[PDB]
């Protein structure tokens, strides 16, 4: 699981194996080693920060510097550390006599699939699920859920072209009553970007339908970008939990390890394969062990492994720079004011958002951008037509510089 981070925590735990009692200066290195592993895995900072500190702390209190098997103490420690960062105990939305959940996320995060696989899971534990295809614009989207429901053996209510939230409220809560369905899984609409109109319609649908839980589905392969999307949706709809998919395709895990601290919401289910049974209830203890090598199962990749710019890129390089701390020394040459921290966390999020509301094609070539677009983008994101146009120019220029310095 998370091969990079996994391999590295192990090299570190391992080097202490068979050495006998170690010295403090040895433990001080093992801690650095771990800190590196997390920082290179994109694990958030106060998370990495706290991870290490919780280790050094729990370790000493376990008589590390005086134990005969120091290695097995770091292992027991790094384990509980991971457990914590991942939520501690396995949680699962609490059930009732009547349940109505919302399934929100971007298009291509496995939302529609999850709906079905989630319906299938609970059916297997008694509940009488009802799936609702709530995208009033895309008939093709609804049809996909329809067939997924036929396969898992669950009923499906398809809304209608242009149906109003109140009409749906009725139709839905009427069919679940008559047919005795205690778990309603509503697959909202999903697109490749965050756009105001829909995020507004979704907000309203919630207001009207009154969901008991709102599960946000995030593709783990998208790294940090997943944590920005979490922010977009809680900020505008209200998420009650997470579902991390394509979790077997993430090599870092920085997103999953930081999701709890950064978003505050828990992880309920996580996909660990593309098999239907692949969507299993998330357990921190399991993921913890696996990361450290216990009870893990090799993944398709883990097996194959044992045998010009882009706006997306630009944003990321800034993200990676901020993370490498301040460059006091490089700034020691230029008499420019110390602490070029005009780049405060909050100033990057404005950009992280600008990109999120941009069309996928517009990110490939911001040039195509016209005025009517920036207007749009600026609205969806929560910024000014200026910040947007500015941000873009900053890119265009860096693109040309980046390009020139090649020839």
Swiss-Prot record:
Record carries keyword Hydrolase: yes
Compartment(s): Cytoplasm
EC code: 3.6.5.4
Cellular component annotations (GO), alphabetically ordered: signal recognition particle
Binding site for GTP: 105-112, 187-191, 245-248
Catalytic activity: GTP + H2O = GDP + phosphate + H(+)
Gene Ontology MF, one: GTP binding
Xref: SMART domains: AAA (SM00382), SRP54 (SM00962), SRP54_N (SM00963)
Domain of life: Bacteria
Record-linked NCBIfam families: ffh
PANTHER family named in the record: SIGNAL RECOGNITION PARTICLE 54K PROTEIN SRP54, SIGNAL RECOGNITION PARTICLE SUBUNIT SRP54
Protein name (database record): Signal recognition particle protein
Source organism (scientific name): Thermus aquaticus
């Amino acid at each position: 699981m998370f091969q990079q981070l996994s391999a590295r925590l192990q090299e570190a735990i391992g080097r202490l194996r068979g050495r006998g009692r170690i010295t403090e200066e040895d433990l001080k290195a093992t801690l650095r080693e771990i800190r590196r592993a997390l920082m290179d895995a994109d694990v958030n900072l106060e998370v990495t920060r706290d991870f290490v500190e919780r280790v050094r702390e729990e370790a000493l209190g376990k008589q590390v510097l005086e134990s005969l098997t120091p290695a097995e103490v770091i292992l027991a420690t790094v384990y509980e550390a991971l457990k914590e960062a991942l939520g501690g105990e396995a949680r699962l939305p609490v059930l009732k006599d009547r349940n109505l959940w919302f399934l929100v996320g971007l298009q291509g995060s496995g939302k529609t699939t999850t709906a079905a696989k989630l319906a299938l899971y609970y059916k297997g534990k008694g509940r009488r699920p009802l799936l609702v295809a709530a995208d009033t614009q895309r008939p093709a989207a609804r049809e996909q859920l329809r067939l997924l429901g036929e396969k898992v053996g669950v009923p499906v209510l398809e809304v209608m072209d242009g149906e109003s939230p109140e009409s749906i409220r009725r139709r839905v809560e009427e069919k679940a009553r008559l047919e005795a369905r205690d778990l309603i899984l509503v697959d909202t609409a999903g697109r490749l970007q965050i756009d105001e109109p829909l995020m507004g319609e979704l907000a309203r649908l919630k207001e009207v339908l009154g969901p008991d839980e709102v599960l946000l589905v995030l593709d783990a392969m998208t790294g940090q970008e997943a944590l920005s999307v979490a922010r977009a949706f809680d900020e505008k709809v209200g998420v009650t939990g997470l579902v991390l998919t394509k979790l077997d395709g993430d090599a870092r895990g920085g997103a999953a390890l930081s999701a709890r601290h950064v978003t505050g919401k828990p992880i309920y289910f996580a996909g660990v394969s593309e098999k239907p049974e692949g969507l299993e209830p998330f357990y921190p203890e399991r993921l913890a062990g696996r990361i450290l090598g216990m009870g893990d199962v090799a993944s398709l990749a883990e097996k194959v492994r044992a045998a010009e710019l882009s706006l997306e890129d630009f944003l990321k390089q800034m993200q990676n720079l901020k993370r490498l701390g301040p460059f006091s020394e490089i700034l020691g040459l230029l008499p420019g004011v110390p602490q070029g921290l005009k780049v405060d966390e909050k100033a990057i999020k404005r950009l992280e958002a600008i990109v999120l509301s941009m069309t996928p094609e517009e990110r490939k070539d911001p040039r195509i951008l016209n005025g009517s677009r920036r207007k749009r983008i600026a609205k969806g994101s929560g910024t000014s037509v200026q910040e947007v146009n500015r941000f873009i120019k900053a890119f265009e220029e860096m693109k040309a510089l980046m390009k020139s310095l090649e020839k």
